[PDB]
Amino acid sequence: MGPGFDFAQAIMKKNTVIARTEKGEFTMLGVYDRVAVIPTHASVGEIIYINDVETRVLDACALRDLTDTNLEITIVKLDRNQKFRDIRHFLPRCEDDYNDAVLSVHTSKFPNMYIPVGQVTNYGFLNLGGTPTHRILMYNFPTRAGQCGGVVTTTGKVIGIHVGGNGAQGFAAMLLHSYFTD
């Protein structure tokens, strides 16, 4: 409807796949080459389904900060025959607050879903499903089951992936450029 949704759509159409693990279907953001991200609670194994194709996982790393605190981001390298468009130049370098963000989801259950979530707070610490978690972004939308892995964007930046909610607020794990240096 506007330039927020325009940027979000451009990311969804070229840089997302549907990932299925034993824990469900997730929006998965492809970042560069065969490297993607997914919430750590997806519990990625040796094999994952990507757009319903059986795919070997070449490497998977559950990120933690240097306080050894969960970040709730898993980086996955996929044995896929095709590279993602490189979107690393759209990743923020530092922890920040944002105005006017969109949360975008693409699954069997929620195809082509775009939610204007508004102001995003650098929340920091969250007890997420009982796990102390750092680098959490917060937005005031009643997000629901099925939105995990959803991509959070502003115009020109990909800032996070949706990892939880409490019925009134939603929470995303930050994406930072430094996670994807190669």
Q: How was this structure determined?
A: X-ray
Confirm whether 72 is a catalytic residue.
yes
**CA-to-CA separations, 161 to 58, 79, 139, in angstroms, rounded:** 22, 22, 12
The span from the CA of 135 to the CA of 168, in Å, is 19
Q: Which residues contact 21 (CB under 8 A, 6 or more apart)?
A: 42, 43, 44, 45, 48, 49
Q: Is 148 a catalytic residue?
A: yes
Resolution of the determined structure in angstroms stands at 1.5
Domain parsing of the chain, residue ranges: 1-15+85-182, 16-84
Which is the catalytic residue, given 25, 72, 106, 134? 72
Instruction: HSE, CB side, 13 Å, CA atoms: give it for residue 167.
Output: 0
**What residues contact 98, with CB distance under 8 A and at least 6 apart?**
119, 120, 137, 154, 157, 159
